[PDB]
Amino acid sequence: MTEYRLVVVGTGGVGKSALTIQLIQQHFVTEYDPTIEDSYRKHVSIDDEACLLDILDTAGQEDYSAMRDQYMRTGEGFLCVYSIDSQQSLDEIHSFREQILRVKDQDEVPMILVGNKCDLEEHREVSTEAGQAVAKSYSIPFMETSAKKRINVEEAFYQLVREIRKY
Ligand SMILES: Nc1nc2c(ncn2[C@@H]2O[C@H](COP(=O)(O)OP(=O)(O)NP(=O)(O)O)[C@@H](O)[C@H]2O)c(=O)[nH]1
Ligand SMILES: [Mg+2]
Ligand code: NA
């Protein structure tokens, strides 16, 4: 069957790991256990095609940027995650994209922009519009997600597989 290697990137604390564990294990990680690097494997069916997903969960903290560089290099597509309560997490997305394109040595790489923590409406400071504006500037799909409420979790990983399929 077809294997897809998906990498989750974005700054520290935005919910990378929680989104991964929702996808893999259908439960919400309430603790913040910061990642250096973890990987997971799941067999799924996407558009009635047999798939194997390899998910690389990477460190968002800046002190680990070089380890992240190395682990990213086997990725085929990327989830670029910010959180809607943090404009700084969105502003850092530009640098994550840049790092992705440099490590893959390509002008375009399958990737989707993910504004996580959308259940935190009381804390929102990035509008859906503002997220959609960043994705539009890079010609990539956009989705708001919630690891806590299970909103668009499967959707975001599966759409990334569809981005990889057309690459
Ligand atoms: N309210 C809410 N909290 C979330 C959501 N996703 C993750 N969190 C919370 O945010 C914290 C950080 O989550 P985590 O997935 O560890 O962040 P990360 O992006 O992997 N951090 P790192 O880059 O350091 O490994 C955790 O307490 C977690 O419960 C969400 O969708 N909504
Ligand atoms: Mg993590
Ligand atoms: Na730990």
Numbering used by the authors: 1 to 167
Please quote the authors directly.
Consider, for example, the Ras proteins, which are prototypical members of a superfamily of membrane-associated small G-proteins that control an extraordinary range of cellular processes. Ras proteins are capable of producing a diversity of signaling outputs by binding to effector proteins, most importantly to the Raf family of kinases, which activate the MAP kinase pathway. Ras proteins cycle between an active GTP-bound state that transduces signals by binding to effector proteins, and an inactive GDP-bound state that cannot bind to effectors. The switch between the GDP- and GTP-bound states is accompanied by correlated conformational changes distributed throughout the structure of Ras. Two segments of Ras, referred to as Switch I and Switch II, undergo substantial rearrangements when GTP is replaced by GDP, as illustrated schematically in Figure 1 (for a comprehensive review, see Vetter and Wittinghofer, 2001).
There are no structures for an invertebrate Ras protein in the protein databank. We expressed and purified Ras from the choanoflagellate S. rosetta. We crystallized Ras from the choanoflagellate S. rosetta, and determined structures bound to GDP and GTP at resolutions of 1.85 Å and 1.6 Å, respectively. The conformation of Switch II and helix α3 in S. rosetta Ras•GTP is very close to that of the T state structure of human Ras, suggesting that the balance between the R and T states of Ras•GTP may be altered in invertebrate Ras with respect to human Ras. The two conformational states have been denoted ‘R’ (assumed to be competent for GTP hydrolysis, although this has not been established definitively) and ‘T’ (assumed to be inactive in terms of GTP hydrolysis). S. rosetta Ras adopts the T state, similar to L120A, where Tyr 71 is rotated outwards and exposed. (B) Sequences of Ras from choanoflagellate (S. rosetta) and sponge (A. queenslandica) are 72% and 80% identical to human H-Ras, respectively. Variable Regions 1 and 4 in human H-Ras interact directly with SOS at the allosteric site, and are altered in S. rosetta Ras and in the ancestral sequence. In contrast, S. rosetta Ras is deficient in allosterically stimulating the activity of human SOS.
